[PDB]
Amino acid sequence: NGLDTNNLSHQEQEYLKEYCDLITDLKSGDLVDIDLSGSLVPPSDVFIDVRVLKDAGEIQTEYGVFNLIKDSQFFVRQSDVERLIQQGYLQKI
């Protein structure tokens, strides 16, 4: 969630919600250049090949506009699509 509601209690739901507000408050203000909910793997490969799993439309990135056509290959940086790998819409290496 930083980068299924039946099983939790209402007190656990509000615990999870307020913890989500805390962890989205942590990366604001100070510690803002990094992301605290980011990837814990080191970026030992600056560019990766990325394969699209599911069709997710046209998305934007920092300085360019990406497509999410299903079953397509990108040769892009790990940090540009690292969050999208975490969502699972992109999955390769």
Partner 1 sequence: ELLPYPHQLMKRLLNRISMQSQLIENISMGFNESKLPLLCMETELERLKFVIRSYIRCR
Partner 2 sequence: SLPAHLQQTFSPEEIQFIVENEPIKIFPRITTRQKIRHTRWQLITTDDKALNNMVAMRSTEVVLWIALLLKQQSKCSIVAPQWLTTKELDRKIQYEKTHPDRFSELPWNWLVLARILFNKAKDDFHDPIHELRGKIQDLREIRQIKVLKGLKYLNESHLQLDNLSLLEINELRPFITEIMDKLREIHTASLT
Partner 3 sequence: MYYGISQFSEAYNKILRNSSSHSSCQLVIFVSCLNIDALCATKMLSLLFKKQLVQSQIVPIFGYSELRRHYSQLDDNINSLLLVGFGGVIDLEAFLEIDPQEYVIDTDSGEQSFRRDIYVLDAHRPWNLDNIFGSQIIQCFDDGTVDDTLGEQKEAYYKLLELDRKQRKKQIHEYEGVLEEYYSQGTTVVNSISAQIYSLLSAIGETNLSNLWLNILGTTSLDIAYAQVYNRLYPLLQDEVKRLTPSSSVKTPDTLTLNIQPDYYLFLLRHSSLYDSFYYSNYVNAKLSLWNENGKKRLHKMFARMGIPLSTAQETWLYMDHSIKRELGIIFDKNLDRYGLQDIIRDGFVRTLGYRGSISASEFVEALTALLEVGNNSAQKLTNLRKRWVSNFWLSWDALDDRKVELLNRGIQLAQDLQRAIFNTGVAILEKKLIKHLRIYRLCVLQDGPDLDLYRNPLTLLRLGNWLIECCAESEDKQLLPMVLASIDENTDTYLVAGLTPRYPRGLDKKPILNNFSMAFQQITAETDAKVRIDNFESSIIEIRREDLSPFLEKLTLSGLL
Cβ–Cβ < 8 Å for 40, 73? no
Question: Measured between alpha carbons, how far is 80 from 66 in angstroms, rounded to an integer?
Answer: 10
Nearer of residues 26 and 53 to partner 3, judged by Cβ: 53
Of 4, 21, 25, 33, which one interacts with partner 1 (CB under 8 A)?
33
Of 14, 43, 51, 61, which one interacts with partner 1 (CB under 8 A)?
43
Cβ–Cβ < 8 Å for 23, 42? no
Verify binding: residue 24, partner 3, rule CB under 8 A: no
Of 22, 41, 65, 93, which one interacts with partner 2 (CB under 8 A)?
41
Residue 50: DSSP 8-state: E
